[model samples]
Target: HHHNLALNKTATASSIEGAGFEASRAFDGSSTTRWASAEGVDPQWIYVNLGSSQTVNRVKLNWEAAYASSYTIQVSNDSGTPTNWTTVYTTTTGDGGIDDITFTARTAKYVRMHGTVRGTPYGYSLWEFEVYG
Candidate 1:
């Protein structure tokens, strides 16, 4: 494995539980901190910008107790708002802990995790979201 492209990058999420669990925590390279979303919700999401367009092939989702049971990994080269998303990978039965997802290489500037189902009652949480190009 090489250096993570997503480390220290700009991260954004659909919703956060509150302070201390900000979206930035998921890319801070620290396991002690994590990003957690609001409880009992569907269609939660998180995304990271690679700063520039690059070929992305793999991702590591280090999930907390709150995980996504169903989600789609998408990419987009279009800027601002990200309306044109292309699905690179998807899973419907994701177990918690860590989800190592890999797909055919795609060039993009933005990567996103769109979760439609929660693994538990709690919202989607991730200790780290690593992207490799």
Candidate 2:
């Protein structure tokens, strides 16, 4: 049997500047119209279901100019609370413009990026955040 899976874009405010903490910026990607912008909301994260319960051996993240210097990948079967969020990997202090990062994945229904450090003054902006099976 195949596990029914779906991806959801969680509720996000229009702007993240007033969100208090910098980590809140990840959810406020404004519109899906264009890539990351400096002043406006430009970074966002999405969830993907593997269609069945399987080991996520690999994860790939493609980024743009405004990149994440550091972030924690949180995982949970329930979307409510993230239980296993290990800092499996981190980007360097410098920017890896238009780059891709691959990592071993953990079985989870909900995954999130808790960005701790921003790469640019405008903060971390992403062209795309992808997960590979």
Candidate 3:
């Protein structure tokens, strides 16, 4: 059975600026709340800790107007650190909707989306970032 592994876990981001945009909102199981990066920033990312290593095979990105045009989905066994991450998926032609991506199942404790290019001039915004196992 498929399950949303990121649900209710610790969600964090590179930057959370402004009133309504926070990293934790991305995994709150609510479509109304969202996460947004700092305006005009290029390299922004949001990650969720699954609490323990789990086999993840899919990721669904529910994006807003300020979405990511170029991005990579990465997984890591180590919950703390900047290195030891492996890229599982990549996309450069994102058009700002629901991007449901699938990849080979991998054991990971942390799942992240690294945004390299913004779809709009504002920044990267996500209504939801979901990981499935």
User: Which candidate number has the best lDDT?
Assistant: 1
TM-score of 1: 0.96
Instruction: Show where candidate 2 strays beyond 4 Å.
Output: 1-54, 79-84, 92-94
User: In model 1, what lDDT does residue 3 have?
Assistant: 78
Model 2 C-alpha lDDT per residue in residues 1-133, reported as the tens digit of each score? 3222222234222233333323222333322322333353334333433334444434444455666666655445544444545554555464545444446666765554545566766754543444444
How well is each residue in 1-133 modelled by candidate 3, as lDDT tens digits? 7879898899879998677898988898888999998988779999999999899999999998898989999999986764688999888988888999999899999999999999888988888889997
lDDT: the better of candidates 2 and 3:
3
Q: What lDDT does each candidate get?
A: 0.91, 0.44, 0.89
Angstrom error at residue 67, model 1: 0.6
Q: In candidate 1, which residue pairs clash?
A: none
**TM-score for each candidate, following the candidate numbering:** 0.96, 0.53, 0.95
Residue clash pairs of candidate 2 = none
For candidate 2, give the lDDT of residue 58.
43
The alpha-carbon deviation from the true structure for residue 128 of candidate 1, after best TM-score superposition, in angstroms, is: 0.3
Highest TM-score among the candidates is held by which one? Answer: 1
- Candidate 3 worst ten-residue window by lDDT: 76-85
